[PDB]
Amino acid sequence: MVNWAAVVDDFYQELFKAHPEYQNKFGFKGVALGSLKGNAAYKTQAGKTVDYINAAIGGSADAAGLASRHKGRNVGSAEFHNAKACLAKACSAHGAPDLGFAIDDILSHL
Ligand code: HEM
Numbered sequence: 001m002v003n004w005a006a007v008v009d010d011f012y013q014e015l016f017k018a019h020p021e022y023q024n025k026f027g028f029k030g031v032a033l034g035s036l037k038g039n040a041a042y043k044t045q046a047g048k049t050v051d052y053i054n055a056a057i058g059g060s061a062d063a064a065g066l067a068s069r070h071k072g073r074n075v076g077s078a079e080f081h082n083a084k085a086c087l088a089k090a091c092s093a094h095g096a097p098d099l100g101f102a103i104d105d106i107l108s109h110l
Contacts, residue, residue, distance in 0.1 A: 002096045008049045010093055012036065014086035025073055056102040063102075067109035077110045 016023045016033055023029055027041030036042040055061035070076070084103045091098050 003094060004050045004053050004096070005046065007087075007090045007094050007096050008046050008053070009037065010090035011049070011083075011087050012042075012046065014089050015083060018086060019079075019082060022079065025075070053099065053102070056099070056105070061102070061105075063105040064109045067106050070106075071110065077107060080107055080110060 013033060013036075023031075023033075026045060028036060028039045028045070031039050031042070052061060052066065056063075070080075080103060084100055087099050087103065
């Protein structure tokens with residue numbers, strides 16, 4: 001099966017490398033990027049991200065609800081466009097399909 005967990009790990013490496021300040025909104029704020037896999041807050045967040053991807057592909061994802069939740073953290077369209085780029089890189093590095101369609105669905109509610 002597609003190793004979405006590995007894709008997600010690379011995604012966060014790309015995301016926080018390009019936009020380190022985004023990491024301050026998370027429970028693993030301040031943690032060195034190279035050590036995130038050993039952080040409990042990160043493990044939970046990564047798991048939820050993997051789940052969301054599998055839900056988008058599976059057809060059960062609630063893109064409107066995820067979009068609203070992000071707005072509730074002052075995360076909007078600009079951040080998701082940046083994320084779209086980081087995720088494309090991560091997908092490509094693992095021979096996984098691009099997930100732009102899934103991010104676009106979230107964007108349609110931002
Ligand atoms: C590919 C793009 C993204 C995906 C698939 C994604 C997915 C998710 C998911 C599934 C959750 C859990 C929501 C829940 O528990 O109901 C979450 C939470 C969150 N996301 Fe994202 N997200 C993305 C982009 C971003 C970006 C660019 C930021 C910028 C800061 C961000 C900030 C947050 C924050 C602060 C939380 C809450 C963390 C917490 O509860 O400790 N997200 N995201």
